[PDB]
Amino acid sequence: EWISGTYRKMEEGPLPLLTFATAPYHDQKPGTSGLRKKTYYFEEKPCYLENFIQSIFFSIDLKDRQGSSLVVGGDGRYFNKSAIETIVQMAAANGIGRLVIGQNGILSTPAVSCIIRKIKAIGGIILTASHNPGGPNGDFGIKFNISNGGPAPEAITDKIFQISKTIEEYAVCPDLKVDLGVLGKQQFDLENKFKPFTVEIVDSVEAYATMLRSIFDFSALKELLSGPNRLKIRIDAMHGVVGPYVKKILCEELGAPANSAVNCVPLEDFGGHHPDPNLTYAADLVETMKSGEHDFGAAFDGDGDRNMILGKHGFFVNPSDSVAVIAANIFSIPYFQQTGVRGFARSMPTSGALDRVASATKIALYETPTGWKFFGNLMDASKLSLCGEESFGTGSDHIREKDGLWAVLAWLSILATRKQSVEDILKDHWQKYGRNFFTRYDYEEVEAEGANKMMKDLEALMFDRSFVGKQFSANVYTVEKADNFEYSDPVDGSISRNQGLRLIFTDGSRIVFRLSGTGSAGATIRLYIDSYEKDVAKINQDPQVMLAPLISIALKVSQLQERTGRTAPTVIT
Ligand SMILES: O=P(O)(O)O[C@H]1O[C@H](CO)[C@@H](O)[C@H](O)[C@H]1O
Ligand SMILES: [Zn+2]
């Protein structure tokens, strides 16, 4: 009971704050999605976690750090609870005034972005490796968000890397034990300090659910998913963090059956499966959808910022299309009614399906590089309201992270509005704006410098006067513009180069080659292919059949097979 903990704290007295010596590491550079390593890096290596955490604290100014509030939460993967305890003790020893932590450490990435902005916190620490597998032999990550609720920009992350490279002492409160299970306030008496330290354990779902409740019309959702004539659906949480949100939001408040949700219990190893939503890693969901029983299926990733949208019989609306449908009927969501369409954005590898809705509605569209930085830059300038990434990313400017369950609720709102099946909505959209046949091949973990050699030699081949205008086909395309995609940010003036080789032809079709920044050992080659078609006779056809020429040209030009040794892609989406 609470009384036992209170009396215990009273008898043990004030908790000491102590400095301990440490040695720095070399690979604590936070990437596009924080700092991600294998779990043993954080669980077994001495003071790895402590070094990184204290680097994060040092990256925050002392003024903003004394007395301020910080959100802490994660996707409930292995080691998250222990690392959260360490974060609590260090925060207590580092002048933080209050930690708002999700119950049992559970807090989806959009939930953290939401709470940060709501409680006016100086930032948040997210214990997630996103779509990467968890468990003792899995992966583990730490993502630092700032006061706008979004990821820490390159300045902050670089400061954390620099500080981490030379750090030699940290502060911790080792006698501090905190129960992450019981909701409510939890105060701690610290030695040599006058103000008590506060750990507030909040519901993992409540605030997020309130935000969705003010974004969507939950009456229409209740009538759609709740009644006897309900729209049969199946939501696969992949044993990820979105489980509690699915159950408390869609099932409890919105009234959909409890057997509508599956795998809605977050497991520290994500049930052994890969917490990534796509047709390859969500086989159970597509095969359950293959019997012709539900009209809408959806999957999420580990931390809840990605989503997969499926229709009846397993119909697959690829992310690049999903964001274009949401844009095409964006005014079915009360939130965008309130804000208006501030702008549209997509990453360069993402198909141009959104571009067509932007051109038809006279709305600015920004083709940004891979990553959140540019999307947040645009959102803070009131120049972006809906954005999406091909990597199953969909989000708006309601927060500063992408949001999977938000995209699902948007799809249910537009389903209830248009009163059609997903396949009908998609087909009508294709005939309305034309179809962007899209595919992406991932060649996972190939020996680098073979891939880098393919990129350098490929780019040299692309910049040649005897290249622009050359004929290719496999029973015809002619090169129009080959380059290394550069992007100038129109908000802060930042310039970004490489970002992926582009082959654009005269029919609008594009072949993009990108080296991954998500990877650990070696390198991952990503091949995107995007071909447009308006001839409504050709709007419907098998995309892997419709695209096969462009694929053959992509590997024949890149010499992928001869330089990597691989004969088939690791995953096709
Ligand atoms: O490995 P990549 O391609 O560099 O990065 C990948 O993970 C990132 C973080 O989720 C996403 O923003 C990218 O869209 C995705 O392509
Ligand atoms: Zn994610």
| DSSP string computed for 21-86 | E----S----BBTBEEEEHHHHHTSTTHHHHHHHHHHHHS-HHHHSS-EEEEEE---TTHHHHHHH
* Whether residues 571 and 447 fall in one domain: yes
Where does a domain end: 204, 231, 254?
A: 204
Q: Which pair of structure tokens corresponds to residue 222?
A: 């209740």
Strand ranges (E), 156-248: 169-172, 184-188, 197-202, 233-236
Question: Sign (positive/negative) of CA torsion 531, 536, 538, 540?
Answer: positive
Distance in Å, CA 112 to ligand 2 centroid: 13
Candidates 202, 289, 298, 319; CA nearest to 256 is 298
Residue 154 assigned to a binding site? no
Residue 113 assigned to a binding site? no
Q: Which pair of structure tokens corresponds to residue 288?
A: 């359950």
* Whether residues 263 and 377 fall in one domain: no
What atom of ligand 1 comes closest to residue 524's alpha carbon? 1
- Decide if 59 is catalytic: no
* Whether residues 133 and 6 fall in one domain: yes
Other C-beta atoms closer than 10 Å to the C-beta of 117 total 21
Q: Which pair of structure tokens corresponds to residue 506?
A: 């005269």
Which ligand number lies closest to the CA of residue 300? 2
d(CA 2, CA 228) in angstroms, rounded, equals 44
* Whether residues 78 and 162 fall in one domain: yes
- Tell me the one-letter amino acid at 198: T
* Whether residues 21 and 92 fall in one domain: yes
Reported as type and span, the H/E element at residue 533 is strand 523-533
* Whether residues 23 and 136 fall in one domain: yes
Distance in Å, CA 409 to ligand 2 centroid: 18
Edge-first strand order for the sheet with 571-572 is 471-472, 477-484, 501-505, 510-515, 523-533, 435-446, 571-572
DSSP bridge partners of 482: 503
Could you give the maximum distance between any two Cα atoms of the chain, in Å?
83
Question: Of the residues 305, 516, 525, 573, which should be mutated to test ligand 1's pocket, given the most ligand atoms within 8 Å of the CB?
Answer: 516
* Whether residues 8 and 121 fall in one domain: yes
* Whether residues 413 and 347 fall in one domain: yes
d(CA 188, CA 335) in angstroms, rounded, equals 41
All residues at 6 or more sequence positions from 285 whose CB lies less than 8 Å from its CB, including other chains: 234, 236, 262, 297, 299, 308, 310
Contact call for residues 105 and 276 (beta carbons, < 8 A): no
d(CA 147, CA 154) in angstroms, rounded, equals 15
Residue 44 assigned to a binding site? no
Alpha helices in 463-570 (DSSP H): 543-558, 560-564
* Whether residues 466 and 539 fall in one domain: yes
d(CA 12, CA 124) in angstroms, rounded, equals 30
* Whether residues 183 and 248 fall in one domain: no
How was this structure determined? It was done by: X-ray
Edge-first strand order for the sheet with 393-396 is 365-368, 344-347, 386-389, 393-396
Catalytic residue among 55, 68, 113, 130: 130
Q: Is 528 left (phi over 0), alpha (psi -120 to 50) or beta?
A: beta
- Tell me the one-letter amino acid at 294: H
In which domain, by residue range, is 366 found? 315-434
SS3 361: coil
Distance in Å, CA 542 to ligand 2 centroid: 29
Instruction: Indicate which residue's Cα is closest to atom 15 of ligand 1.
Output: 391
* Whether residues 503 and 486 fall in one domain: yes
d(CA 127, CA 69) in angstroms, rounded, equals 17
Other C-beta atoms closer than 10 Å to the C-beta of 4 total 8
Contact call for residues 216 and 223 (beta carbons, < 8 A): no
Question: From the DSSP assignment, how many helices (H) and strands (E) are in the chain?
Answer: 20, 27
Where does a domain end: 400, 434, 468?
A: 434
Q: Give resolution in angstroms.
A: 2.7
Question: How far from 568 is each of 6, 265, 441, 455, 528, CA to CA, in Å?
Answer: 61, 34, 9, 19, 15
* Whether residues 323 and 417 fall in one domain: yes
Domain count, the chain: 4
SS3 content of the chain, % helix, strand, coil (to 5): 35, 25, 40
Q: Is 297 left (phi over 0), alpha (psi -120 to 50) or beta?
A: beta
Where does a domain end: 434, 449, 481?
A: 434
**Which are the residues after which the chain is interrupted (C to N > 2.5 Å)?**
475
